[PDB]
């Protein structure tokens, strides 16, 4: 015999209270078994609580599907919007126990500091932050990562979560060392509105900044669909070899080849060559050229060059003739076709302007659709092309798609330009629609200024921006792909033959026979038979559109956590174990089982890993802030109404807080893997990381509980 007892909230003190060790243990192990059994109860209840705080804070869209048989199906289906708020309204629900327990203790035990609220708060904080993270690391698929994306806000969230626990040390040890004074404790609650407004503004901030791709997945509820962030998915005749030459104006200089064939090649030949205007004009289009071409002993051909003048005047097709004469053998002669009609192509304009196609099919998922134009027959000169959006099958005006029009200038020598437009994510299953993107006449710009020589100049000027064929784009609005696939999967699986005559209060009861009418499941649920049956009676499903379970399951959590508080109070200090220890060791691992499942499924199911850690951070923040706020606010106010100090214990907690903060800094540190870019993403992919970081975190949690227990044993620690 080492410890006496304290009267509970519901349960009374065990009658003899001090038998031999033959009974100082049996009642203790009975207590422990009843406690783990109530922990299973609380697990199932908080499961239902989360699954009914998710029906509220969610939108339902109506979907109709035309069956090929000749009829259709019209049914509304919820789509849980996964904002940042919808993770701080389920990091809270999932942490409903560790708050209410704290509320009961101080009320139950005569408005005095019952040291099983802070101990369980810190114990569950360390347990989650060191073990749920290990699971989020080593429960992902065999090899793959879901590395965090919004690392920009994790710093703030984690620095808040760790400012929370080192604030307990602040309230009761540094401003007043042993008192939760009246003014403090009030802000411990008011700091929760800080978090809620932070969520309620930093969701909108990152909502419109991101039209990012919203992947869809199947919630484990009846018909919930969860949206989240993802990525997007024998005479030597001499003559021209060719009597006609083709070349472009931009070349300037062009080459002509003149071949001697047959006869005696050893004779040096001198042949006069000279150019003459055909349709060409010297000094404006090309330069007149003349001279002598010399063939060495043994040559077969020679090359000459003539200059061609290029300008910004888009002239018509044009040519001029080069002629040869005066063949001298110093057997050989001037070959036939000794004149080359060099013909030229002018390209000094822009010309044809046409769209890609007149019709395209684009899903609403893109949101910002980016389609191009195309130029043909040159690009010189500047243009100003109007682009108009005209409504179609659906009604535009920035309702189904952002309908705006206007004008875009195409700079000189720019072949390709791409115009954008914005598109709504109406967030609904539909079919195709249509809209139009007609083009009209651009405005031409040449040189900034805007007898036959001038008339031919205008005959050249005719080259201007003329529209091509494709001048109006009727885009087709399509259906989001993943959304279609997910709703198809769900309809093929569930949500069939539904009407509210009797949905659950008659059918939440069938689980007994529905599950026990292979051999593993038997013993897997002969401990939950009672719990499930007792949990189908009182929290009936969402008849009140979400609030038909959240107004009851909270009361049942109150009942079960009253049982937990009383039994943990009467088990600790019965075997002799200090009351605080069994929080950090025993109660914490059972009050926070829902969190583990929530984070685990979030990690293994989505594509990122910020919700799975957002859960941990939100739970750690709300536990401490809300729990101590309400419990110690009411305690301090009660002692204020008649003038007392509320002398909470400074010690027995400070060491745990400081140790947790040190270990939490180590956590946040090693979270960013050493050499991370080739030690994989956040969760998985590297065998060594995935398989040893988890063991490190488990060792850290083990050291935490071990040293909390040691400090409670001997207390000789430096604090
Ligand atoms: C000053 C208060 O700081 C706070 C500290 C902790 C808090 O708890 C949570 C922390 C992170 C959460 O997820 C973040 C998230 C971001 C994202 F881009 C996409 C999905 C996400 F899940 C949810 C809850 C809150 N809400 C505020």
Author numbering: 51 to 283, 405 to 501, 518 to 637, 654 to 720, 736 to 937
Paper quotes:
The Na+/Ca2+ exchanger (NCX), belonging to the CaCA (Ca2+/Cation antiporter) superfamily of secondary active transporters, forms one of major pathways to mediate Ca2+ fluxes across the cell membrane and significantly contributes to the regulation of Ca2+-dependent events in various cell types. The NCX is a bi-directional and reversible transporter, and utilizes the electrochemical gradient of Na+ to exchange 3 Na+ ions for 1 Ca2+ across the membrane, thus performing electrogenic transport. The f-loop consists of two tandem calcium-binding domains (CBD1 and CBD2), which exert allosteric regulation of NCX activity by binding cytosolic Ca2+. In addition to the CBD1/2, the exchanger inhibitory peptide (XIP) region located within the f-loop has also been determined to block NCX activity in response to high concentration of cytosolic sodium ion ([Na+]in).
In this work, we purified the recombinant human full-length wild-type (WT) NCX1.3 and determined its complex structure bound with SEA0400 by using the cryo-electron microscopy (cryo-EM) method. The final selected particles were subjected to 3D refinement and yielded an EM map of 3.5-Å resolution, which includes many well-resolved features and clear densities of main-chains, side-chains. NCX1.3 structure consists of 10 transmembrane helices (TMs 1–10) and the large intracellular regulatory domains CBD1 and CBD2, with both N- and C-termini located at the extracellular side. The conserved residues for coordinating Na+ or Ca2+ are accessible from the intracellular side, indicating that the current NCX1.3 structure is trapped in an inward-facing conformation, which is stabilized by both the XIP region and SEA0400 antagonist. Structural comparison between NCX1.3IF and mjNCXOF also reveals a steric hinderance between the XIP region of NCX1.3 and TMs1/6 helices of mjNCXOF, suggesting that the XIP region in its current position would prohibit conformational transition from the inward-facing to outward-facing state. It inserts into a juxtamembrane, highly negatively charged groove formed by TM1, β2, TM2, TM7, TM8, H1, and CBD2, and is largely stabilized by complementary electrostatic interactions. The SEA0400 molecule is allocated within a negatively charged cavity surrounded by TM2ab, TM4, TM5, and TM8. In fact, the pocket and passageway are separated by the TM2ab helix, indicating that SEA0400 inhibits transport activity through an allosteric fashion. The ethoxyaniline group of SEA0400 forms hydrogen bonding interaction with T138TM2ab and hydrophobic interactions with F248TM5. In agreement, since SEA0400 stabilizes the straight α-helical conformation and disrupts the local backbone dynamics of TM2ab, the association of SEA0400 allosterically inhibits the conformational transition.
